[PDB]
Design a protein around this ligand. Structure first.
Ligand code: NA
Length: 368
């Protein structure tokens, strides 16, 4: 209930309250705040855009990716840097080619952020550009590419480190020689899913989801029954990104978890998967104790597009929570059947307040 003031305060005329919203959404915000924070990225204030990138990466939702890739071409250097670090933290491979370009950014601190990003994604296409980055004019940029080659650490790395220790000059040489003096991936993380330490399990689920390999499905389904709810919810998100339809049934079981964040993550995942069998259980999740879960239920039913949620969403237009209503209105928009039209005209004439207001609007939008 702190979140919704900030979400609304994201479109406020004042540029001082936009900043405090974005700032706070960086600390508190969750998946509900990405579509708004994605819009915040188009602001006039560079502080609002920056803080919005900062938060999108902290939230870590894949929808922020094509937007943050455009924010990499922002006029403000510190907004470019935020966009780079955020793509870093989301771990989506589509950022790699444009993060490589940012590796030659006019500003030193942007190059550092691009190097770090490329390190954290661990895609191998960055190894050569990263190796070329060791000869950058700025020592700190060179140092950041060193650390990013370390993070990736493939055989492509060791290959380039050998060639450099054999042949290179200056810092690049120093780095390669030290590399030698001190010294596939999916399978390591699947094993880490079964680790005793909780952070190792969590990070494993995080990792497998970003990687997106279908190997990880059956082990992540198992992590849905994890001791710890943070791990439980990470494995659900990861299953959502992977998109493998084998998680559908065990995800429907996560819709009845003790933890609200696991339930929330399970529903968002089922909408991404888009399988019809989530419709019934998601409909029953629009009546949840938790206003986040009720939101995710509407959103996912939006993604799925099945007409059996029309009236449960109409009902959801009168939810106590503001943005659950907003989500249900969006969802009826996506579905958009001949059914939805007829429901909306009834609601135009007989509705009250918010539900009436969006029933009127829907009808205005769908005319030509
Ligand atoms: Na900022």
């Amino acid at each position: 209930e702190k979140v919704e003031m900030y979400i609304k305060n994201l479109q406020d005329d004042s540029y001082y309250v936009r900043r405090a919203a974005a700032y706070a959404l960086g600390k508190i915000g969750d998946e509900r705040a990405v579509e708004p924070l994605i819009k915040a990225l188009k602001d006039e204030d560079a502080w609002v855009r920056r803080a919005a990138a900062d938060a999108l990466g902290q939230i870590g939702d894949e929808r922020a990716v094509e937007p943050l890739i455009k924010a990499l071409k922002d006029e403000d250097g510190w907004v470019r840097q935020s966009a780079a670090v955020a793509l870093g933290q989301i771990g989506d491979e589509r950022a790699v080619e444009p993060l490589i370009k940012a590796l030659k950014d006019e500003d030193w601190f942007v190059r550092i952020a691009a190097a770090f990003a490329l390190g954290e994604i661990g895609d191998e296409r960055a190894v050569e550009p990263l190796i070329k980055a060791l000869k950058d004019e700025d020592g700190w940029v060179r140092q950041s590419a060193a650390d990013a080659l370390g993070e990736i650490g493939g055989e492509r790395v060791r290959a380039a480190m050998e060639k450099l220790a054999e042949t290179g000059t200056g810092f690049a040489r120093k780095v390669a020689v030290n590399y030698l003096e001190t010294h596939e991936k999916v399978e390591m993380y699947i094993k880490n899913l079964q680790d005793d330490s909780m952070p190792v399990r969590y990070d494993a689920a995080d990792a497998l989801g970003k990687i997106g390999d279908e190997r990880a499905v059956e082990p992540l389904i198992k992590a849905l029954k994890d001791e710890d709810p943070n791990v439980r919810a990470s494995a659900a998100d990861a299953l959502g990104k992977i998109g493998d339809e084998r998680a559908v049934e065990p995800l429907i079981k996560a819709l009845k978890d003790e933890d609200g964040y696991v339930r929330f993550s399970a529903a968002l995942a089922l909408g991404k998967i888009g399988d019809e069998r989530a419709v019934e259980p998601l409909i029953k999740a629009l009546k949840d104790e938790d206003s986040r879960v009720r939101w995710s239920a509407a959103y996912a039913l939006g993604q799925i597009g099945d007409e059996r949620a029309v009236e449960p969403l109409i009902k959801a237009l009168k939810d106590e929570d503001w943005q659950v209503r907003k989500a249900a209105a969006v969802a009826l928009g996506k579905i958009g059947g001949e059914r939805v039209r007829a429901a909306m005209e009834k609601l135009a004439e007989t509705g009250t307040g918010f539900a009436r207001k969006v029933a009127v609007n829907y009808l205005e939008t769908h005319k030509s």
